[PDB]
Design a protein around this ligand. Structure first.
Ligand SMILES: CCCCNc1cc(C(=O)O)cc(S(N)(=O)=O)c1Oc1ccccc1
Ligand SMILES: CCCCNc1cc(C(=O)O)cc(S(N)(=O)=O)c1Oc1ccccc1
Ligand SMILES: [Cl-]
Ligand SMILES: [Cl-]
Lengths: 474, 474
C-alpha cells in the first residue's frame, strides 16, 4: 500500500541485519584468539562469499519484475518451482530460528548486565529465556504495527549504533591512564607489533573461528527478502546491497584492527597490578606496557582479550552507551529477521505449491501483510527460546543460510550457462563463472561447518523436493 | 551381426563378472575376520544394493528398445543426455580400471603360486606387472577375436569354475586326518558354535569388511552393458540378471558358512603340532579339536583363517584344480569388464555429445565392433598396471560403481515420481520407493567407502555435467 525504496529500507535494514550480536561481544574474543593478519583474512573470505551472493541476487533482480518474497520466487522462476519452494521454506525456517538466536543473545547480554550491575533474578540459568519471552512479545507487538513504525524503529536503532561506534572510536582514540590494569593502553606500537601474527589458542582453530564468526556476516539481501514491498524493485537492490556489504566489511576490518592494536592478550586486572615497570625478565609485552599485571601464562588470570566480554565496552568511556549499542544491535537484527521471514512464507503460500499450507495466506492490513506468518514465526522463536542453549544447534542451522546462498548461486549459474528464454541480465560486470565459484565456496563452507549438519541439510532439501514433486501441483 | 540372447550371454557373463578374484582368496580371510552371523549380514546388505540396482535396470530395460551401450543411453533417455554422457564416461573409466586391477590380482596369485611351487623371477615386486603385461596382451588377443570366440572362452571358464566349486565342496564334505595341523577338521560342531559370533580382529571393523568385500559384488548387469548385441533386448535382461544375482548370493552364503564351519582361526601348522589331544586347560577350540597346534594368542603363529591365503585350496584335494579356479575366475572377470567398457564408450561416441571424441567411433568388423575402444581400454589398463599397487586407489574407484548405481536408481525414481511421457514400465512388482531406498543405500555406502573419494566423485560428476552442458550439443 505504501511504496518505500532504496535509501531507508535497504540501507537501515541491511545495516542492522548484518550487524548482529557478534560485533560488540564475540569480535573482541575472536580477534584476541587469532591475530589481525588472519582475522582480516577470515573476514575477507566471508566477505567474498557474501558479495558473490549479493551479486548473484542482483543478477536475478535485474532480470524482471518480482512478484514478491525473497529467494523463493527467484529460484522458482529461474530453475524450477520445486527448488524455489524448497529454498524458500528452508530459508524461512532458518530466519525464524535466527530470530530466536538473536533475541536469546539479547537475553544473555541483558541478564549479564543486570546481574553485574545491581541484582539478579531467581533461576538465572533460565532467566535469559524468562526475559526473552517478554522482549519477544514486545518485538512482535512493534513489528505488527505496520511498516512505518518498524522503519522508524529501524532508523533510530541505526542512529543508536552509529553513536555507539562513535563513542567507541572516541574512547580508543584518547588514551586513559585509568585502564593500566586492563589491556587498554592507547594504541601502543608494542601491542600492534605483537598482534599481526596468527597467535592461536589452546583448542580453537581457523575453522572454529570461521564457524563462530560467520553467522554475523549473514543477514544480507534483507531488501530482497521483502522485494514485494519496495518502491523501486530490480533497481535499488544491487546498488544498495553492494554498498551495504562494502561498508559492513570496512567497519568490521576497522574495528578488528583497532581493538587488536588497542588491547593486549594478557591484562591481569587487579589492584596490585600497577605500572611500576619492575625490571623483570621481560619475555612478554607486559613489562613493555606495565610491570604489574603480568605472568598470565602460569595460571589463567582475570581477563583481557582472551576472557573479557565487556572489553569492547569498557575500552571507551560511557559504558552504558556501548551497552545500549549491544541492545540496539541485537534488537534491530531480531526485528529485521522477524519481518523478513513471514513475508517469504507468504510468498511460499501465495503460489499454492504446498496444498497442506492452505492457511497462512494473505490477510488483514492495507498491504499484503502476512499476520498469520507473524504469529507462526513468533511461536517458532518462542519454542526455540524455551529449548534454550542455542549454541548446540548453532552450526546445525549455520549451513541453512549456506543452503540458501548456494541454491541462489547455482540457479544463476544454471540459468546463465544453460540458455534460458528469459535470462536477460542487466547489471554491468558479471563474469558468470564467479557465480559458480561462489557456489563452490558455499558448498565448501557447508562441509567445513559441521559436515554432518551439511549432509542433513542436503537430505532435508531432497526430502522437500520429493515431497513437493509427489504432490503434483497443477 | 549375430544375435545371441538370454542363456549364454546373460548367464555366463553375469556369473563370471560377479564371481571375481575375491571368492577364492579374500573370502576365507574376511570370514575369519567377521563371523557367520555378521558375514551373512554384510553379504545380504551388498545383495540388497545389487538387487535394487538390478530391478532398477530391469525397469529401464522393459521401457523400450535400447539403441546400445549400458547406463549411458538409459540415463540419457530418462533424465537428460548430459547426465547420460557423464554417467557413461565415468562408468566406462571405472570398468577400464577394474580390468587392470582384476588382471593385476591375477598376476599376484600366479606369481605367488610360481614362487611357492618351483622357482621365482628377478624383481618379484614388479614380476606381477611383468607377467601382467603379457597376460593382458593375451587377453586382448582372445577378446578381439569376435563374439563367438569370447563366448566359448567364457563358457569354458565358467565350467572350470563349476569344477572348482565341486572339488572344493567334495574336499570339505570328506574329512581328512592329514590336515590336523591345519584348521580343516571335518565340519566339527565345535568350530561352528565358536564362529557364528562377530569375532573381529586387531584393526578391521564392519565398514572395513564392507569396503573390502563390495568390489567383488559389483560387475552385475554386464548384459545391460552390451544391450546392443543381444538377441532379445528388454526381455532377457531382467529374468537373467535377477536369477544371476540370486544364485550368486546363494553360492556366496553357502561357501561362506561352509568355510566358517570347516576351519578354525587357530591352526598352528607345524610338525610338532599333532592331534595328541593333551589334557590342557581348553579355553580355546584348538585342544577341543587337537591338543597340538595351539597357543596362537601369545605370539603370531603360522596361519589359519587369519593369515593363510591358500586355505581355500588346501582345504580340498587337488590344489592345482583350485588354482586353475582362481585363474579362470579372474581371467573371466577381466575379460567381461574389458568387453563391457569399450562398447559403452562406443555408445558414448555414437551420439557425438562429446565433440572432442570425434575418433573412437564404429570401425571394422561385421557388427558394430569398437576396436579403437579396445585399444583405449588396453592402454588405460596397461598404465594402471604399470602404476602397480592398486589397493591404494581401490576405494577411490569403489564408489564409481556406486555412482553408476545411484544415478540409475535416481533415474528410475525421477522418471516414475515426476511424470514422463514415455516411462511405461512393464516388470511386475515395482513398489517405486524401492528405487529411492536403493539410491539412499548407494549414497550411504559411498560416504562410508572413503567419504573423501565420494566427494571427489561428486566433483567429477559435476565437472562432467558442466563440461557437457557448456559444449551445447545440437
Ligand atoms: C543461522 C543464523 C544464526 C544467527 N546467530 C548469530 C549471528 C551472529 C551475527 O554475526 O549476526 C553471530 C552469532 S555468534 N554469537 O558469533 O555465534 C550468532 O550465533 C549466536 C548468537 C547468539 C547466541 C548464540 C549463537
Ligand atoms: C571398482 C571395481 C573393483 C574390482 N576389484 C575387486 C573385485 C572383487 C570382486 O569381488 O570381484 C574383489 C576385490 S578385493 N581383492 O576383495 O579387494 C577387488 O579389489 C581388488 C582386487 C585385486 C587386487 C586389489 C583389489
Ligand atoms: Cl539469506
Ligand atoms: Cl555397473
Amino acid at each position: 500500500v505504501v511504496k518505500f525504496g532504496w535509501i531507508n529500507g535497504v540501507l537501515v535494514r541491511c545495516m542492522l541485519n548484518i550487524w548482529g550480536v557478534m560485533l560488540f561481544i564475540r569480535l573482541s574474543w575472536i580477534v584476541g584468539q587469532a591475530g589481525i593478519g588472519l582475522s582480516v583474512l577470515v573476514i575477507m573470505m566471508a566477505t567474498v562469499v557474501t558479495t558473490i551472493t549479493g551479486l548473484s541476487t542482483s543478477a536475478i533482480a535485474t532480470n524482471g519484475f518480482v512478484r514478491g518474497g525473497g529467494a523463493y520466487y527467484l529460484i522458482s522462476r529461474s530453475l524450477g518451482p520445486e527448488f524455489g519452494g524448497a529454498i524458500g521454506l528452508i530459508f524461512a525456517f532458518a530466519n525464524a530460528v535466527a530470530v530466536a538466536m538473536y533475541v536469546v543473545g539479547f537475553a544473555e547480554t541483558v541478564v549479564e548486565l543486570l546481574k553485574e550491575h545491581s541484582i539478579l533474578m531467581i533461576d538465572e540459568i533460565n532467566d535469559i529465556r524468562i526475559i526473552g519471552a517478554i522482549t519477544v512479545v514486545i518485538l512482535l507487538g512493534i513489528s505488527v504495527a505496520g511498516m512505518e513504525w518498524e522503519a522508524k524503529a529501524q532508523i533510530v536503532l541505526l542512529v543508536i549504533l552509529l553513536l555507539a561506534i562513535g563513542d567507541f572510536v572516541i574512547g580508543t582514540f584518547i588514551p586513559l591512564e585509568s585502564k593500566k590494569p586492563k589491556g587498554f593502553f592507547g594504541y601502543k606500537s608494542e601491542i600492534f607489533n605483537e598482534n599481526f601474527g596468527p597467535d592461536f589458542r589452546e583448542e580453537e582453530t581457523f575453522f572454529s573461528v570461521f564457524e563462530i564468526f560467520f553467522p554475523a556476516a549473514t543477514g544480507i539481501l534483507a531488501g530482497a527478502n521483502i522485494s514485494g514491498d519496495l518502491a523501486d524493485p530490480q533497481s535499488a537492490l544491487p546498488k544498495g546491497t553492494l554498498l551495504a556489504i562494502l561498508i559492513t566489511t570496512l567497519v568490521y576490518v576497522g574495528i578488528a584492527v583497532s581493538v587488536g592494536s588497542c588491547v593486549v592478550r594478557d591484562a591481569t586486572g587487579n589492584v596490585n597490578d600497577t605500572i611500576v615497570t619492575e625490571l623483570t625478565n621481560c619475555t612478554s609485552a607486559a613489562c613493555k606496557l606495565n610491570f604489574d599485571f603480568s605472568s598470565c601464562e602460569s595460571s589463567p588470570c582475570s581477563y583481557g582479550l582472551m576472557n573479557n566480554f565487556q572489553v569492547m565496552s569498557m575500552v571507551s568511556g560511557f559504558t552504558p552507551l556501548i551497552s545500549a549499542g549491544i541492545f540496539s544491535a541485537t534488537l534491530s537484527s531480531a526485528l529485521a529477521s522477524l519481518v523478513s521471514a513471514p513475508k517469504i512464507f507468504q510468498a511460499l503460500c501465495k503460489d499454492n505449491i504446498y496444498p497442506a499450507f492452505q492457511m497462512f495466506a494473505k490477510g488483514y492490513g492495507k498491504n499484503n501483510e502476512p499476520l498469520r506468518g507473524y504469529i507462526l514465526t513468533f511461536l517458532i522463536a518462542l519454542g526455540f527460546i524455551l529449548i534454550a542453549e542455542l549454541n548446540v544447534i548453532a552450526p546445525i542451522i549455520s549451513n541453512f543460510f549456506l543452503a540458501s546462498y548456494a541454491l541462489i548461486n547455482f540457479s544463476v549459474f544454471h540459468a546463465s550457462l544453460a540458455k534460458s528464454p528469459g535470462w536477460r541480465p542487466a547489471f554491468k560486470y558479471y563474469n558468470m563463472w564467479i557465480s559458480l565459484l561462489g557456489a563452490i565456496l558455499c558448498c565448501i563452507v557447508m562441509f567445513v561447518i559441521n559436515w554432518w549438519a551439511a549432509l542433513l541439510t542436503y537430505v532435508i532439501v531432497l526430502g522437500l523436493y520429493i515431497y513437493v514433486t509427489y504432490k503434483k501441483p497443477d
